[PDB]
Amino acid sequence: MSEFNITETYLRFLEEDTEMTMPIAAIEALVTLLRIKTPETAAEMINTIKSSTEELIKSIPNSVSLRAGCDIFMRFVLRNLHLYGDWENCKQHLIENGQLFVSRAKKSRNKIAEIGVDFIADDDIILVHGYSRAVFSLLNHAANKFIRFRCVVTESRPSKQGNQLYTLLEQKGIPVTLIVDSAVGAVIDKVDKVFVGAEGVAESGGIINLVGTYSVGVLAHNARKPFYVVTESHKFVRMFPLSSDDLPMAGPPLDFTRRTDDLEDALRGPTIDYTAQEYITALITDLGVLTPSAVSEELIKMWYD
Amino acid sequence: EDRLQAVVLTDSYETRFMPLTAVKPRCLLPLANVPLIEYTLEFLAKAGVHEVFLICSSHANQINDYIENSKWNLPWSPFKITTIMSPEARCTGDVMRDLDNRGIITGDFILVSGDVLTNIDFSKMLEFHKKMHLQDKDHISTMCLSKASTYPKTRTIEPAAFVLDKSTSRCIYYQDLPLPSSREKTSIQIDPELLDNVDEFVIRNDLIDCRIDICTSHVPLIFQENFDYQSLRTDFVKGVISSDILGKHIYAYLTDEYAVRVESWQTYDTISQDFLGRWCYPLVLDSNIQDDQTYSYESRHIYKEKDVVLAQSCKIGKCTAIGSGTKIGEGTK
After folding, report:
1. Nearest-CA distance A134 → chain B (Å)
2. Would residue B263 be called left, alpha or beta, if left means φ above 0 and alpha means ψ between -120 and 50 degrees?
3. Does B84 contact chain A (CB < 8 Å)?
């Protein structure tokens, strides 16, 4: 009898497929929590799932996609707790709704492409940043559409993700180079469109993914090239920062301590930046193309009370 | 006034296109990816006609298979479309005496010979015709002609001298004229006996023919007796103004913009580039009219339909057009 906390349920099926990502894995674990542990009373169910979400955030704090999944699960159990079935059917009604995310959010990524293929037009040199697999889910259907384009992939120092794209869509058959991440300003005068992928959307439209998407965003603004971001609808999160600095990793982004003998010195600054709403200009979700004030309204309506 | 009749008389230029044109007529050749009947037909449907009469002197079955599979034998077409089957290679003119022996045409009607492509609002050509009716009871027709003033010498087969009036633009006289390759034939003659009561006239070379003549139903009856005519203008408009029948004057109209007619490949190239460029507004290509294409328009004059596979590392320059389902490759230009 599993306890669903850390790895007795969650981290097992992350090794089943390296295509499922973190937040829908969190959705799958949280629905299979109360799919079995349903002790016929509406009180301790919500206590169990709130305890489970807080210990799962307590497992890995610096992967804020997890917070997005573990909080839209609370929105799911709140709205499915609504319609007021007196808990007599909801013990069966909520769990038969249940797996509609793993039948729904799993097949959201081609629904992204079905509305985002009509962005990359003919002969567009494209800049992507980091292994954001929804961007590749758009680009796969774009190359299957037989449309002519070129791609440029940045480095993802120190998180290594930029080396994956050049070994991902090269074998699909797209002419692609791998620029280094510092060389954006000398090339973004030539890049037609730039895509990124978020690990979170704030309450105004923000990109909380990686090391330097604020840098490539402010390069996109002072080259006046359109800065799109491909995401999907399990990436909304309540966390609305105000600076370019989020929750810390373990200390401040500006360390000034002493290296003892030979410890690592690359990851000493920040690793997850923030982008304001001005630098993004259109984001892609399951809900269509979505201007950032629309994503602000969409995350302002389902989070108030 | 209304109930406009019409007659298109194709299939007189098979001498021009002889390596082609023996397996399908001149009128069924794709100028811009679609066989150019409708480049006349959409024009004179916008002119608002009610019946046409396709003379098909050759390949008559592969006229009517396209005509019955067109959008014109469907019960909302602005004209009903009828054909005329034919023994082979009749000279023009005698088709009108065959028409008068049959006796269908009553009223004003278009003598559109050849295959034209134009932007002219034919509606404002009606009031020129009716001003001809009101200010002359001895009229014959009106002849719309283009003003291609920036180029003589390059309208290939026949250069002409449309000498006409200053004030009323009545066509005074007409004469065929030789070619720039011939330095030999250097004279034309206009004898001044019929030049008595004109006192003001203009003689121009920069008017290209387009064979769009609209007249009254009196002039086929005029044309009935004088059975000597075999062309439409080398013999007739000379032989109707040269003091032959008294009290029958012919008029001719000049437009200000693009209105052209197919002669040969040294005109087919030029009109293909004028139509495929934006020199033919509003009768343009990207509007996707004829056989419900999907042409889009980039800058630099690019025309592409859906399902076009442009391969990588190709370049596509000015003024091109690509149909659907094609496939180009690497390194092409």
Report:
1. 24
2. alpha
3. no
